[PDB]
Amino acid sequence: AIYTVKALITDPIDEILIKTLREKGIQVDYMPEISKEELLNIIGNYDIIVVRSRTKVTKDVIEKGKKLKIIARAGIGLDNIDTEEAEKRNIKVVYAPGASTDSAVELTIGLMIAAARKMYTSMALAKSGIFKKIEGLELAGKTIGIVGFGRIGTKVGIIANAMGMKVLAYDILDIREKAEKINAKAVSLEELLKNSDVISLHVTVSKDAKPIIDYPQFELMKDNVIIVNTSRAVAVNGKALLDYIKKGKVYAYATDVFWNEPPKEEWELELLKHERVIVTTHIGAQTKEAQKRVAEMTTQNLLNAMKELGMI
Amino acid sequence: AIYTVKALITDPIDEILIKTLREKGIQVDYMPEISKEELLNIIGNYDIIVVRSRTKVTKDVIEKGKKLKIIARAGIGLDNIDTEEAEKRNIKVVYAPGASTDSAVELTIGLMIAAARKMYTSMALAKSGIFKKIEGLELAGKTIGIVGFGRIGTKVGIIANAMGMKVLAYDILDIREKAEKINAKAVSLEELLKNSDVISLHVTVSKDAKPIIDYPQFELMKDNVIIVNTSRAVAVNGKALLDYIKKGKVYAYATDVFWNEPPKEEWELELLKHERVIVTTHIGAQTKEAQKRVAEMTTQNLLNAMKELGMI
Ligand SMILES: NC(=O)c1ccc[n+]([C@@H]2O[C@H](COP(=O)([O-])OP(=O)(O)OC[C@H]3O[C@@H](n4cnc5c(N)ncnc54)[C@H](O)[C@@H]3O)[C@@H](O)[C@H]2O)c1
Ligand SMILES: NC(=O)c1ccc[n+]([C@@H]2O[C@H](COP(=O)([O-])OP(=O)(O)OC[C@H]3O[C@@H](n4cnc5c(N)ncnc54)[C@H](O)[C@@H]3O)[C@@H](O)[C@H]2O)c1
Numbered sequence: 001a002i003y004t005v006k007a008l009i010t011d012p013i014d015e016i017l018i019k020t021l022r023e024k025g026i027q028v029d030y031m032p033e034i035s036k037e038e039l040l041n042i043i044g045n046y047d048i049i050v051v052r053s054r055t056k057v058t059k060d061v062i063e064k065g066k067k068l069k070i071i072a073r074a075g076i077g078l079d080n081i082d083t084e085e086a087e088k089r090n091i092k093v094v095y096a097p098g099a100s101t102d103s104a105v106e107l108t109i110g111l112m113i114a115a116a117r118k119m120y121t122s123m124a125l126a127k128s129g130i131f132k133k134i135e136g137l138e139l140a141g142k143t144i145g146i147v148g149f150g151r152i153g154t155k156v157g158i159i160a161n162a163m164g165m166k167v168l169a170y171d172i173l174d175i176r177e178k179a180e181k182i183n184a185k186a187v188s189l190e191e192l193l194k195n196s197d198v199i200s201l202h203v204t205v206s207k208d209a210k211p212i213i214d215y216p217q218f219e220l221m222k223d224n225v226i227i228v229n230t231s232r233a234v235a236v237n238g239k240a241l242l243d244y245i246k247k248g249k250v251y252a253y254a255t256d257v258f259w260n261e262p263p264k265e266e267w268e269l270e271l272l273k274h275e276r277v278i279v280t281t282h283i284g285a286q287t288k289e290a291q292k293r294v295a296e297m298t299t300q301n302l303l304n305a306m307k308e309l310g311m312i
Numbered sequence: 313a314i315y316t317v318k319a320l321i322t323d324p325i326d327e328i329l330i331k332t333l334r335e336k337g338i339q340v341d342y343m344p345e346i347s348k349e350e351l352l353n354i355i356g357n358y359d360i361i362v363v364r365s366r367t368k369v370t371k372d373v374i375e376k377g378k379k380l381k382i383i384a385r386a387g388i389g390l391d392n393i394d395t396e397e398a399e400k401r402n403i404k405v406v407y408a409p410g411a412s413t414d415s416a417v418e419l420t421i422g423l424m425i426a427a428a429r430k431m432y433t434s435m436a437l438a439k440s441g442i443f444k445k446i447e448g449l450e451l452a453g454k455t456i457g458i459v460g461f462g463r464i465g466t467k468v469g470i471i472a473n474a475m476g477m478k479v480l481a482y483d484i485l486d487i488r489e490k491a492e493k494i495n496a497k498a499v500s501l502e503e504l505l506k507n508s509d510v511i512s513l514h515v516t517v518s519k520d521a522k523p524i525i526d527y528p529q530f531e532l533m534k535d536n537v538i539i540v541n542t543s544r545a546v547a548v549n550g551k552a553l554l555d556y557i558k559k560g561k562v563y564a565y566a567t568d569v570f571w572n573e574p575p576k577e578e579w580e581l582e583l584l585k586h587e588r589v590i591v592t593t594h595i596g597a598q599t600k601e602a603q604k605r606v607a608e609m610t611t612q613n614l615l616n617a618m619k620e621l622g623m624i
Contacts, residue, residue: 102452102476109475110425113418114435117599119592123432126591127584131573133593138601140414162474163421164414261443272439279438280431281445287429289450 005311006067007048010034010055013074014295017050020303024312040064047311050074050302051081059085070305074298076100076285079207092305096297098151100285105155107256107284108200108230113139115226115254115278116198137226137251140164145196147189147212148203148231149175156200157184168192193220201229201236211237218244229255230284242271254278317623318379319360322346322367325386326607329362332615336624352376359623362386362614363393371397382617386610388412388597391519404617408609410463412597417467419568419596420512420542425451427538427566427590428510449538449563452476457508459501459524460515460543461487468512469496480504505532513541513548523549530556541567542596554583566590 005026009018012032021028029046031038034055043049043065050072051057057071059082073081073095086093114120117136125132144160146153149171157167157179167184169175170192179186189212193199199221203212213227214237227250229236238259244250253276261282263269271277285291306312317338321330324344333340341358343350346367355361355377362384363369369383371394385393385407398405426432429448437444456472458465461483469479469491479496481487482504491498501524505511511533515524525539526549539562541548550571556562565588573594575581583589597603618624 103450106425106451106475107429107431110422110429110431113422114426114431117419117422117592117595119419119422119426120432120435122592122595123426123590124436126574126593129574129584131570131593133595133598135598135600135603136595138415138599139418159471159474162471163418258443262438262441272441278435280429280434281438281443283429283434283445283448286445286447287450288447291447 003311005047005306006045007050008034008043008046009050010039011050011052011074013050013052014291016295017072017074017299017302020299026306026312043068048072048302048306050298053080055080057081057086062086062089062091069309070094070302072298072302074294076294092309094298094301094305096294096301099293099297100287100290101151101155103287103290104152104230104256104284105159107280108152108156108202108228109159111230111254111256111278111280112144112198112200112226112228115228115252120278121275137224139198142166142197143168143195144198144200145170145192146184147171147192147199147201147235149173149178149186150202150204152230153200153202154178154182156202158182160198160200165198168196189217190220193217194222196225197222198226198228201227201231203231203235205232205235207234209234211235211240213237213240215240218249221249223249224251225249226251227253229253229257231257233257233259238271239267242267242274245271245274245276250276252276252278256280256282256284258282315623317359317618318357319362320346320355320358321362322351323362323364323386325362325364326603328607329384329386329611329614332611338618338624355380360384360614360618362610365392367392369393369398374398374401374403381621382406382614384610384614386606388606404621406610406613406617408606408613411605411609412599412602413463413467415599415602416464416542416568416596417471419592420464420468420514420540421471423542423566423568423590423592424456424510424512424538424540427540427564432590433587449536451510454478454509455480455507456510456512457482457504458496459483459504459511459513459547461485461490461498462514462516464542465512465514466490466494468514470494472510472512477510480508501529502532505529506534508537509534510538510540513539513543515543515547517544517547519546521546523547523552525549525552527552530561533561535561536563537561538563539565541565541569543569545569545571550583551579554579554586557583557586557588562588564588564590568592568594568596570594 048070143166146169149169169179170189176186360382455478458481461481481491482501488498
C-alpha cells in the first residue's frame with residue numbers, strides 16, 4: 001500500500017507551514033497545546049514533528065518516536081531539541097538558521113544608541129510631560145569592538161563603520177580578510193578590549209560554557225565603556241558586570257538578553273533596576289519580516305528534507 | 313589711551329570661553345542670571361556680548377548696545393538673536409554652526425529603530441519585571457526618504473544605506489550629485505513620499521512658514537510609514553499628523569522636537585500620549601562631545617572676529 005506520511009505539530013505556528021503540508025496531502029495533526037504526557041503516548045505514530053519552543057524534543061521523546069524521520073523547529077535555534085540523539089537516529093533536523101539576522105542587527109544598533117544617549121530616561125520623562133534634557137555620549141570617531149564576527153557581527157560592523165566609528169573585531173575563527181573587507185581590523189580579544197569605547201557581543205556559546213567576558217576582560221576594558229549584548233546572556237559574567245557598573249567603570253550595559261527573563265536572583269534584580277542598564281525583552285527576532293522568514297524557511301527546509309526522503 | 317575691550321556674558325556657559333577671554337586680558341563681566349531690565353541698563357558699556365539661550369538679544373537690546381561689535385551665541389542656532397538688526401549695525405554674529413551634526417545623526421537613527429521596534433514599550437515592560445515580547449518592523453531592504461539633505465540628512469542617508477535601506481532624498485537645493493555619491497537618489501518630494509517606508513526630516517525652516525509635511529503629503533505617503541523628526545516641529549502639521557495616526561496610516565512618529573516642550577494644547581497632549589508617538593526631550597545636541605565642540609567653536613569664532621577687529 002501507499003505510505004501516508006503523518007506529521008504532528010505540537011505548538012501554535014504560522015499557518016503557512018500547516019497549509020503547505022495539507023495542500024500536499026500530508027496527514028497533519030495540529031495539537032498546539034498537547035501535554036508532555038500525551039505527546040509521549042502518541043509520538044510513535046509520526047514521521048514528522050514540528051515544534052516551536054514550548055515543546056521539548058528530549059532524548060526520551062525521540063526514543064518513543066520510533067517512526068520519526070524529520071524534526072522541524074520553527075525558530076532560529078535548536079536549544080529545545082536533543083540534536084545529538086537525533087543524529088544517532090539519523091533523524092533530519094531542520095529550522096531557520098540566520099532568518100532574523102537583519103532584525104537582530106538593527107536592534108543592536110538601536111540598543112547601542114539608546115544606551116549612549118539615555119534615550120529610555122528621556123522618553124520616560126517626555127511621556128510624563130517633563131521635557132528636561134539629558135546628556136549622553138557621541139559615537140562618531142570612537143572605536144567599537146565586535147566580539148563574534150558572524151552573520152550579525154559583520155553587519156553591525158558595516159553599520160558602525162558608516163557611523164564613523166573605528167571597527168575592531170575578534171572571533172575564535174579566522175576573520176582577518178573578512179574584517180578588512182568592511183574596513184574593520186581583526187585583532188586579539190586583548191587588543192579589542194583595551195581599545196574599544198563600545199563592545200558589542202554577537203557570539204554563539206553553550207549554556208554550560210564559562211563567560212567570554214569575565215573579570216580579566218572587564219579589567220582590560222576602557223573607562224566609560226558601553227557594552228551591548230544581543231547574543232547570549234551567558235557570554236557575560238553578570239556578577240562581574242554588576243561589580244564594574246557599581247565601580248562606575250561601565251557607562252552602560254544594553255542588552256536584549258538576560259540570564260533569567262524575568263530576573264529571579266538578587267544580583268540579577270539589582271542589575272535590572274540600575275540606571276546604567278538598558279534592557280529589551282528578547283525582541284531581537286521579533287519583527288513581522290523576520291517571523292515570516294522563520295516560517296517560510298522552516299517550511300521550505302522541511303519540504304526539501306521530505307523530498308530527499310521521497311515523501312514528496 | 314589703550315582701548316580696554318569689555319565683554320558681558322549673560323548666561324551660564326562653558327568655562328573654556330571665559331577662561332580664554334580672561335587669559336587674554338579682556339575685561340569679562342560674568343552675570344549668568346542678569347535680569348532683562350538690568351541688561352538694558354548696562355549693555356551700552358560692552359563691545360562683546362555672549363549669550364546662550366535664556367537671554368534674548370532683541371532689537372531694543374542692540375539699539376541700547378551702542379558699543380556692541382560682536383554678539384556671540386554659545387549654541388548651534390541663532391533664534392534668540394535679531395540677526396537682521398545686528399547686520400544693519402554691522403555687528404559680527406558668531407556661534408557654532410554644525411557643531412552637533414554627528415550627535416543629531418545618531419539620535420535620528422536611534423529614534424528610527426526605537427519607533428520601528430517599539431523599544432520604549434519593551435524597555436518599560438522589562439524594568440517592571442515583565443519580559444513579554446513585542447513585535448515591530450525590520451528596516452533592511454526598505455526605502456528611506458531623507459527630506460532635507462544637508463549636514464545631518466546626508467549622514468543619516470549614509471548610515472541607512474549601510475543598514476541595507478534604499479535611500480531617496482529631496483531638498484529644495486540641488487543635490488543630484490551629492491545624493492549619487494552616497495548611493496542615494498535625489499527625487500521630487502512627491503516621489504519620495506509615494507515610495508518611502510521611512511521618512512526622516514532634517515530641514516531648516518522658519519517659525520512662521522507653513523509645514524512642509526501637510527495634508528497633501530500625508531495622503532501621498534505609503535501605509536504604515538514611519539516618520540522621524542529631529543529637525544523642527546513646525547516642519548510638520550501636527551494636527552494632520554494626529555489625524556493620520558488615528559486613521560492607522562502612520563505606524564509611528566519618532567521625534568526629538570515638539571511644537572511645545574512640554575505640550576500645552578489639547579491636540580499636542582493627545583499626540584504625546586499616543587502609543588505610536590515616540591519622543592525624546594530635544595537631546596539631539598546633548599552629548600559631552602557635541603557640547604564641548606559648541607564651546608570650543610564659539611570660542612574660536614569669537615577670537616577670530618576679535619582678531620579681525622584688531623582687538624587681539
Ligand atoms: N536577541 C535575539 O533575539 C537574537 C536573534 C538572532 C540571533 N541571536 C544570537 O546572536 C548570536 C550571533 O548569531 P549569528 O547568526 O551572527 O551567529 P554566527 O554563527 O553567524 O556567528 C557567531 C560568531 O561568534 C563566534 N564565536 C563563538 N564563540 C566565540 C568566542 N568565545 N569569542 C569570539 N567569537 C566567538 C563564532 O565563531 C562565529 O563567527 C547568537 O548567540 C544567536 O543565538 C539573538
Ligand atoms: N534635535 C536637535 O537637538 C538638533 C541638533 C542639530 C540640528 N537640528 C536641526 O536639524 C535640522 C538640519 O540641520 P543641518 O545642520 O543638517 O542643516 P543644513 O543647513 O545643513 O541642512 C538643512 C537642509 O534642508 C534643506 N531645506 C530647507 N527647506 C526645505 C524644504 N522645504 N524641503 C526640502 N529641503 C529643505 C536645505 O536647503 C538644506 O540642504 C535643522 O532644522 C536644525 O536646526 C536639531
